[PDB]
Amino acid sequence: VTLFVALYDYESRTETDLSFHKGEKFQILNSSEGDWWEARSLTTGETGYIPSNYVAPVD
Ligand code: NA
Ligand code: NA
Ligand code: NA
Ligand code: NA
């Protein structure tokens, strides 16, 4: 799967995690470290870690 979609808005705590809005689409850069994945928003062109329980695969 290339794109994942945000299920809800998320407000990040630090510069590590990425704030995003429901419906944004992301490419996943790295999901190998755990359930928080480094991701690149196609909607905003920003990157950071996102909680994988806040996204679903676009398929
Ligand atoms: Na942030
Ligand atoms: Na954002
Ligand atoms: Na993982
Ligand atoms: Na998920």
Side-chain angles (χ1 to χ4, degrees):
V1 172
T2 298
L3 291 181
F4 284 73
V5 60
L7 302 175
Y8 291 91
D9 287 4
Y10 176 74
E11 184 181 318
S12 63
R13 186 196 303 273
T14 75
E15 291 182 359
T16 301
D17 50 328
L18 172 67
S19 299
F20 54 85
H21 295 291
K22 178 179 187 303
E24 286 190 36
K25 301 294 182 61
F26 303 89
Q27 289 180 81
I28 306 308
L29 301 171
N30 196 339
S31 65
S32 80
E33 300 167 335
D35 289 339
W36 290 72
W37 301 345
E38 198 162 355
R40 181 171 167 127
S41 176
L42 179 58
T43 314
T44 65
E46 300 171 291
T47 63
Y49 280 80
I50 63 171
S52 66
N53 62 333
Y54 273 64
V55 300
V58 181
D59 52 26

